[PDB]
């Protein structure tokens, strides 16, 4: 289907097809770590969690974090035999490219080197950024997991949107992204299934166009993650110093999500 309304600026059939085609051409592999035998999935989760932490410290957008996450996973699928000592460099360089692209006044190169405590220099980040961009074939315009949540919220509050509900769903998506198994599902299905866990099947079909059958396997995979978030209660909307109050929902936040990931991975 297609959940877009009649658009003035363009034909909704074309706008929606291009978006579906973007998800077609941008590929993700839930088994990319098999190409790196010295690496285990808990390393990816710890690295992505760390990037989320540095994102909040610099008031970086959630799109900036998801651009870095996508660049990391996609770049790692073009590589082989990577050691865990190189993972911090690949991660902070993915974040550097993303901040340059998404932020208006991104943090400076020395600030990206700083958060690594000397394990990464500015020169290394500049060498690595060119390696990542060239290996990704300059394909740096993905539709992130969080951009789909944004699309769904825009459609829901048309038929601007509320900040509190957005951050609760985003908080569930942040927990899921730490598990490489999430990469089995298209980004639009992960966001549709996170939205379902906070509403209904009727609402997700209305804002995403997906049918229940489409998101069902993803919903049953997300069930432990969603339950761990429900047990503890959802987070409250934070205020960010020097950030407009109509944009606070779009700022990346951090939580003790690694223990929540262990509870969801057990069941």
């Amino acid at each position: 289907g297609s959940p877009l309304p009649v658009l003035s600026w363009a034909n909704r059939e074309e706008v929606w097809k291009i978006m579906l085609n973007k998800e077609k051409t941008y590929l993700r592999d839930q088994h990319f770590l098999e190409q790196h035998p010295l690496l285990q999935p808990k390393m990816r989760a710890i690295l992505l969690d760390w990037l989320m932490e540095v994102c909040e410290v610099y008031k970086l957008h959630r799109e900036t974090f998801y651009l870095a996450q996508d660049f990391f996973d996609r770049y790692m699928a073009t590589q082989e035999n990577v050691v865990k000592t190189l993972l911090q460099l690949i991660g902070i360089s993915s974040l550097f490219i993303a901040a340059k692209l998404e932020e208006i006044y991104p943090p400076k190169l020395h600030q990206f080197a700083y958060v690594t405590d000397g394990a990464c220099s500015g020169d290394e980040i500049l060498t690595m950024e060119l390696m990542i961009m060239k290996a990704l074939k300059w394909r740096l315009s993905p539709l992130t997991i969080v951009s789909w949540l944004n699309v769904y919220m825009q459609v829901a509050y048309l038929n601007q949107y509320p900040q509190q509900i957005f951050i609760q769903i985003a908080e569930l998506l942040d927990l899921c992204v730490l598990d490489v198994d999430c990469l089995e599902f298209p980004y639009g299905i992960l966001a549709a299934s996170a939205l379902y866990h906070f509403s209904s099947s009727e609402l997700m079909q209305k804002v995403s166009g997906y049918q229940w059958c489409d998101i069902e396997n993803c919903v049953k995979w997300m069930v432990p993650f969603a339950m761990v978030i429900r047990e503890t209660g959802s987070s409250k909307l934070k205020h960010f110093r020097g950030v407009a109050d109509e944009d606070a929902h779009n700022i990346q936040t951090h939580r003790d999500s690694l223990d929540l990931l262990d509870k969801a991975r057990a069941k």
Partner: protein, 291 residues
């Protein structure tokens, strides 16, 4: 980069240096955009990362093709399809005789098709102006310089082609900013001079008000609430479009006034403009499936 021979330097600006070049083997003529990296503390410029990534995904006959991206120690070359001239040079060259109306119609039609493609990908060009419109000897015109191009965006184009909502402090950009620039360019092609040649933001706004009239809540609801709106703005009557654009027919004046509408929400879209009776001759009827 060893397989390229620089023929001539076409320009230098914030984009870097653009050259005309030849593939020593192939024999093809390309446009090269050179970007210095050794002089960049923040690495590959954000504006170059965005342009490259965007053009890899924006393939259209009226958008300059990015053929390749070569990294050569402290340099980054972007190999583009070559075009012989920019619209400003062409317009100045044709200023005494005038650009023939059929060519103005053709260039506008192609511009709107390129713009409609960009907008269907949710991309705002943000910097539409004559020196960014590249023409060739085979009758084509293509959108160039996607450095300021943002996918929808908040407000932070050279004055003459800037939409009134931008000058009046609107917080968010829309697709209607590109339409405004095309209307200015369309009128410039017709009148052989800039429609609104201001020398400051206030001068630009007053020049727009002298031709279209000072806007009110009736023509543009929200205008008086806007950040840079002043109640002291002189009251100007909207000039008759038969004087603003004399060589234009009834269908031309209709399209131009729809592209220059004050209200961003009512300004004609690129797709809707392509279906205007001004291009009845250029456009072909397509059957609609209701379903």
């Amino acid at each position: 980069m060893e397989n390229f021979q620089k023929v001539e330097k076409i320009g230098e600006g914030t984009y870097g240096v653009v050259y005309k070049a030849r593939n020593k083997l192939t024999g093809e003529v390309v446009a090269l955009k050179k970007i210095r990296l050794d002089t960049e503390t923040e690495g590959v410029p954000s504006t170059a990362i965005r342009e490259i990534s965007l053009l890899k995904e924006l393939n259209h006959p009226n958008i300059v093709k990015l053929l390749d991206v070569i990294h050569t120690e402290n340099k980054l070359y972007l190999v583009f399809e070559f075009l012989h001239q920019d619209l400003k040079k062409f317009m100045d060259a044709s200023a005494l005789t005038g650009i023939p109306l059929p060519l103005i119609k053709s260039y506008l039609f192609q511009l709107l098709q390129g713009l409609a493609f960009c907008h269907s990908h949710r991309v705002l060009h943000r910097d539409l102006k004559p020196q960014n419109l590249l023409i060739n000897t085979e009758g084509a015109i293509k959108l160039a310089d996607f450095g300021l191009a943002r996918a929808f965006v908040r407000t932070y184009v050279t004055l003459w082609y800037r939409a009134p909502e931008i000058l009046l402090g609107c917080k968010y950009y829309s697709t209607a900013v590109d339409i405004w620039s095309l209307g200015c360019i369309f009128a410039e092609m017709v009148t052989r001079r800039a429609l609104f040649p201001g020398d400051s933001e206030i001068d630009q706004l007053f020049r727009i008000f002298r031709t279209l009239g000072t806007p009110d809540e009736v023509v543009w609801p929200g205008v008086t609430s806007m950040p840079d709106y002043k109640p002291s703005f002189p009251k100007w009557a909207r000039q008759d479009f038969s004087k603003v654009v004399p060589p234009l027919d009834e269908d031309g004046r209709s399209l131009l006034s729809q592209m220059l509408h004050y209200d961003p929400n009512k300004r004609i879209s690129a797709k809707a403009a392509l279906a205007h009776p001004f291009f009845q001759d250029v456009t072909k009827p397509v059957p609609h499936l209701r379903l």
